[PDB]
């Protein structure tokens, strides 16, 4: 969303996300993500692939 605020096209944000894939949150470091991830993974059609 910050990159879109800087007037970037859909290609610029994608390559920005490609080089920043390691900044996604960790479940252990956040208590909120603990139950959200458990609830998210309980959906029928969720595949780890």
């Amino acid at each position: 969303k910050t990159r879109y605020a800087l007037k970037d096209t859909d290609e610029e944000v994608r390559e920005f996300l490609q080089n920043n894939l390691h900044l996604q949150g960790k479940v252990e470091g956040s208590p909120s993500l603990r139950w959200q991830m458990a609830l998210y993974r309980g959906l029928p059609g969720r595949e780890e692939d």
Partner: protein, 49 residues
Amino acid sequence: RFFAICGLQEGFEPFAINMQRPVTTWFSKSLPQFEPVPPEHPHYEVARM
């Protein structure tokens, strides 16, 4: 039963999401009791002579 349908994606959390014991609840008991007359009671005033 409906948190995922409406409320989960909007950023709302359950009121007791991370709590060990059930939330303590208080109820209005309809047993008359004697209590001191409030100093700011709209209708009743007590003067110490």
